């Protein structure tokens, strides 16, 4: 290939910039690549599915850990109808004092936004109660992603 | 091609030929450090005076450190462009013919190693120019307005 | 005269790959340190709101 991209020789001979562009759109594609066969295609499909699952698992692990480190679940139990949820702490070096003012809500020690993804009702319906539960779940999910 | 007084004149060609980016009679590293200190003295002004801490007695050091950071970023960009476009043993691509037609030695400034010397010189010169503008703006600072 | 000083006080800064390494690691370390050591007087973030906030509609939730 002698240069990017490594999957289509026809592109590599494009001194026009569109090379880079089509060096992105036609990467995941497998039929159009050069020197591709059936069983190779299937093994690639398998590796890609594993990667996708790794991504999903890391995503949900991050959800859990962030709630566990800055969320409100524990003290949200005591009144799920008068204490808004919390998503994650704000650290924005572009704010002014009134910004920091109008974001510290729901009973926190800094600017935080309200978690709207419904994850609290989910993790509360099954019956979880403490931040330690969330830590354990996050560790398990992270190890599963690595696996 | 068209040759207007702008693109073709004694004084304009003279000026453009005298600035360091074309005086091939000097080492490329020295031209690099010269342009670097030039831009270093250049950029400190607005960055400091109009920065987001201008109403604070720290605005000087703030603007100067920001200028230094921008200089570092651009030196990174220079080195990156050089390693991207310039190979390490291949010839030069500088104009080797002057206006009269004197076949010029391939400008060592337009070589991989030459571009590297240029980048290093520019970075060091930008740092020096920034700190010099600081020391001349916040110690010996009467005859200016800021 | 000035050429020797300009050469010697920026002599190790000539190798290009070394130059990328040094600039990148130095920039990272510097920004991390200055942000971790940011003083609250010049940054409205390094301190909290320090006032009692407003409750949302419908009581607090």
């Amino acid at each position: 290939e002698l240069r990017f991209p490594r999957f289509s020789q026809g592109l590599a001979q494009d001194p026009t910039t569109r090379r880079i562009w089509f060096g992105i759109a036609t990467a995941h594609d497998f039929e159009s690549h050069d020197d591709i066969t059936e069983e190779r295609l299937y093994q690639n499909i398998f590796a890609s599915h594993f990667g996708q699952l790794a991504i999903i698992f890391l995503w949900t692990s991050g959800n859990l850990f962030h709630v566990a480190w800055q969320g409100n679940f524990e003290s949200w139990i005591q009144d799920p109808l008068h204490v808004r949820p919390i998503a994650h702490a704000i650290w924005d070096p572009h704010f002014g004092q009134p910004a920091v003012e109008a974001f510290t809500r729901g009973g926190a020690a800094g600017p935080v936004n309200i978690a709207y993804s419904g994850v609290y009702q989910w993790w509360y319906t099954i019956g979880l109660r403490t931040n330690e539960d969330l830590y354990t779940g996050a560790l398990f999910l992270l190890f599963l992603s690595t696996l | 091609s068209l040759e207007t007084p702008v693109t073709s004149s004694p004084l304009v060609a003279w000026y453009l030929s005298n600035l360091p980016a074309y005086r091939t009679a000097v080492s490329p590293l020295l031209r690099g450090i010269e342009v670097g200190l030039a831009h270093g003295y250049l950029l400190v002004g607005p960055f400091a005076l109009t920065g987001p801490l201008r109403n604070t007695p720290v605005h000087g050091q703030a603007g100067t450190l920001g200028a230094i950071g921008l200089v570092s970023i651009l030196s990174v960009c220079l080195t990156m462009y050089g390693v991207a476009s310039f190979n390490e043993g291949e010839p030069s691509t500088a104009p080797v013919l002057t206006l009269t037609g004197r076949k010029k030695e391939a400008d060592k400034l337009q070589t991989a190693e030459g571009w590297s010397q240029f980048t290093g010189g520019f970075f060091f010169g930008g740092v020096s120019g920034a700190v010099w503008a600081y020391f001349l703006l916040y110690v010996l600072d009467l005859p200016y307005f800021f | 005269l000035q050429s020797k000083f300009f050469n010697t006080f920026a002599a190790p800064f000539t190798k290009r790959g070394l130059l990328l390494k040094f600039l990148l690691i130095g920039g990272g370390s510097l920004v991390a340190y200055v942000s971790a050591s940011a003083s609250p007087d010049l940054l409205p973030i390094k301190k909290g709101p320090q006032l009692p906030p407003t409750p949302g509609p419908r009581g607090k939730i």
Binding site: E1, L2, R3, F4, I20, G23, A89, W91, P93 | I73, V76, M80, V83, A84, S85 | L20, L24, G27, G28, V31, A32, S35, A36, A38, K46
Partner: peptide, 30 residues
């Protein structure tokens, strides 16, 4: 605290090194 260490890193220096690495890559010529 820890945000002040990490957010600036994943905002400026890590994206910078990623961008320059991919620049160097796509500009390769073997």
């Amino acid at each position: 605290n820890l945000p002040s260490i990490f957010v600036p890193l994943v905002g400026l220096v890590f994206p910078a090194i990623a961008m320059t690495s991919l620049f160097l890559y796509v500009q390769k010529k073997k």
